[PDB]
Amino acid sequence: DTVVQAGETVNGGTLTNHDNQIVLGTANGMTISTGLEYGPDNEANTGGQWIQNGGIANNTTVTGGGLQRVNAGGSVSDTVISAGGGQSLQGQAVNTTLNGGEQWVHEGGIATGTVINEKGWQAVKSGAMATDTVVNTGAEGGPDAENGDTGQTVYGDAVRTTINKNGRQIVAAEGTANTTVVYAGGDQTVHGHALDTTLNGGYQYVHNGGTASDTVVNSDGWQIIKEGGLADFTTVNQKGKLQVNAGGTATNVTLTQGGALVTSTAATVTGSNRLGNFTVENGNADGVVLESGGRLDVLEGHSAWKTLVDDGGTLAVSAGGKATDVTMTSGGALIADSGATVEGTNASGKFSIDGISGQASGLLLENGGSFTVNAGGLASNTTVGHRGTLTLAAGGSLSGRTQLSKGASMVLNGDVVSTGDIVNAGEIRFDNQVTFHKLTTSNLTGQGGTINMRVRLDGSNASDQLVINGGQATGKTWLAFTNVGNSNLGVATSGQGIRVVDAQNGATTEEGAFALSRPLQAGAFNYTLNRDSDEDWYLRSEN
C-alpha cells in the first residue's frame, strides 16, 4: 500500500506520480520512479521511498526522478540509481551502484560499497562517512578537465576508496580520505587531509593547504605537491615520481632506487635516498639523487652540492645558479649554458662550467643533456652523445676535441670558430634561431657524420661554409645541402663555383673527405661537389 509496517515485508511495486512508501519493516525489490522530478533540494518535490528507523530496503531500483530517503537507523542494501535519481542517506547503505545517479551522505550516514559510474556523484558531507567506494567517473578529460559535481566529493571521511580510470576523488578542505589506491587514469585532488594513499599509476594533487601523509608512489604514479601543499612520509618506488612545485613542501621523503624526484631549489624537500639524507631548503640542495625520471632545477641565485645524476636523471642549472660536487653517471642529463656554474665528474672525467668567464670544459651531453655557448663563451673538450645537443649562439666558440657521437646534435646559430678538432659521427646544422655562416675549425675528423648546410642557387653563389684553418679534413663527412632559394631557379656557377669548404693557411683535405648525402638541383642544373688542387671543395653546375 503506502506504509510498510514493522515486522511486515513487501515485495515488488513501483512508485510513480509522487506516491509514497514509508518503510518501517522491509521493502524488497521496489522500483522508485518518483520524488525527485524537480531536481535535488526542491520544496516542490513530493513522493518517494522513505526508510524509517528500523526499516530496511533490499534491491531497490531508483530510476530517473526517483528519490530514496534513508533516515538515521534506516538501512538499505543493494541499490542501483540511474541518472536523474537520488538517495539521501542518514542511515546505512551497503552496495549502491550509481549509473549517473547521486548519493548524498548526510551527517551520521555511512555509505559502504558505492560504485560511481557514468557521471554520478557521491557527496560525503561533514560528519558523514564513505567506506569501500569505487570511483569510475569524475576525471574524464584528464587532470586539467573539470567535471564539477561528479565522482566523489569528500567533506567528511572517506575510507578504503578505489579510484579507477576516469575516477576522481576531491578531498575538500575539511574532508579526510584515509585509505586510497589510485590507478592509471584516476586522480585524487587534496584540499584536506589524505592518509595512506597508494598511487598504482594514478595521480595525487596536493593543493594549497592540503596535506598528504604516508603516500606510496608506485610505478607510473605521480604525486604533485603544489604551492602551499604538504606531503609527509612519501615513499617513491621504482618508476614512481614525486614532484614538488615552487613553494611546495615534502618532508620525510623516501626515494628508493628508481624513484624520481622532480623539484627545484624554490621548493622544500627533505628525506633520504639511496645514498643517505638530502635536503632542499632556502634555495640550497644538498645530497640530491636524481633517478631515472628525476630532475633538479637549480634556479638563478640558488645552489646545489653533492648531487648525483644517475641514468635517466636530469640536472638543470640556470644562468646564475651553482652546482658543485656533481656526479654524472653514464646516461645522466646535464642542462646548462655558459652563464651557469657547475663542477664535478662525468663518465669521461672532470668537467666544469665557469659562469663568470663563460668557459666550459669536459662536458658530456647525452640522454637529453644540452649546453648552449653564449657570445664570447667557450666549450672545450665537449663530448655530445646520443640525444645530446650542443648549441652555439653567434659569437660562441669551441676548443680542444669536440666529439659528436651518432645521434648527437650541434646547432650553429652564427659564425663559429673551433680552435681544435671536431670529430663528427653525428649531425651538425647551420640555423638562424636567411644569413649564411662559417664553421671554422683547425681539424675536421669525419666519422660518417653529417653537416647540414644552406645554399642559394639563384645566382648569388652564396652558402654556408666550412673553413679548415691550417690542419686537415680527414675521414668521411656527409654534406646535406638545402637550397633556400626558389626551387625552379637554377643559375650556373662560374669559375671554380661555390666554395663550400675552404682550406686555408696550408690546410689539406683528403680526396674523399666530403660527399653530398643527396642530390642538389635547381632549374636546369645539377650541382656536384668537387675537390680541386687548392684543397678546397666547390659546388659546380652541370646539365
Residue numbers in the entry: 2 to 434, 452 to 561
What are the paper's exact sentences on this?
The best-characterised SAAT, antigen 43 (Ag43), is a protein that contributes to cell aggregation and biofilm formation in commensal Escherichia coli K-12 as well as in major pathotypes including enterohemorrhagic E. coli (EHEC) and uropathogenic E. coli (UPEC). Ag43 possesses a modular domain organisation that is common throughout the ATs, which encompasses an N-terminal signal sequence that directs the secretion of the protein across the inner membrane, a passenger (α) domain that is responsible for the function of the protein, and a C-terminal translocator (β) domain that facilitates the translocation of the functional α-domain to the cell surface. After translocation, the Ag43 α-domain (α43) is cleaved but remains attached to the cell via non-covalent interactions. Similar to α43a 13, the α-domain of all three Ag43 variants folds into an L-shaped right-handed three-stranded β-helix, with each turn of the β-spine comprising three β-strands linked by loop regions.
The α43_UTI89 and α43_EDL933 structures in this work correspond to the uncleaved α-domains. To investigate whether this mechanism of self-association is conserved in Ag43UTI89, which imparts a reduced aggregation phenotype, we first examined its oligomerisation in the crystal lattice. Generation of crystallographically related molecules of α43_UTI89 (i.e. symmetrically related molecules in the crystal lattice) revealed a head-to-tail dimer repeated along the crystal, which resembled the α43a–α43a functional dimer. However, while α43a trans-dimers are stabilised by two interfaces consisting of a total of 18 hydrogen bonds and two salt bridges, α43_UTI89 dimers are formed via interactions from a single interface comprising 13 hydrogen bonds. To test if this α43_UTI89 crystallographic interface was indeed involved in mediating bacterial aggregation, we constructed a mutant with seven amino acid substitutions (Ag43UTI89-mt: T32G, N60G, D79G, T80G, T98G, N100G, N137G; mutations to glycine were adopted as glycine residues are enriched in the loop regions of Ag43 β-helices; Supplementary Fig. 2). Modification of the single interface in Ag43UTI89 completely abolished the ability of this protein to promote aggregation, confirming the self-association interface observed in the crystal lattice. Conversely, the reduced aggregation phenotype of Ag43UTI89 is a direct result of the weaker α43_UTI89 dimers, which are only stabilised by a single interface encompassing 13 hydrogen bonds. It appears that the inability of α43_UTI89 to form a double interface may be due to the presence of long sidechains on residues such as R161 or D133 in the F2–F3 loops mapping in the lower part of the β-helix, which in a head-to-tail association via a double interface would result in steric clashes between interacting proteins, although we cannot rule out other amino acids that might also interfere with this interaction.
